[PDB]
Design a protein around this nucleic acid. Sequence first.
DNA 1: TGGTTTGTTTTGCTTG
DNA 2: CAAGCAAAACAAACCA
Length: 86
Amino acid sequence: RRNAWGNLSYADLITKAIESSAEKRLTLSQIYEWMVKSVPYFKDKGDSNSSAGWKNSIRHNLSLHSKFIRVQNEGTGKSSWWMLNP
DNA sequence: TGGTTTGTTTTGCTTG
DNA sequence: CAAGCAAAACAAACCA
Ligand SMILES: [Ca+2]
């Protein structure tokens, strides 16, 4: 097993999180929520004391890879919609 | 206000 | 080298 959560990469997980939404787009917070609810390894690492490292990598992957694109959100103070780049 | 989130980038290290 | 994990500097936007 490549990582402690399996053979899927962070990018792969982010992809599954987004593909799981009916609208094919999720905010950063929703992607975190999907990890904690969907990946066994992260189930007990959603708290502030242990989520810093992996959340940082999620933000890192989202910005770094062209596979993901950011879309301006609707309304005041809401963060971007993240989706798969066609 | 002043701490927290979100987002962008760069760097270090390990593998195939 | 490319893929990827991990750590981290910085800064605009948020928001309690
Ligand atoms: Ca991107």
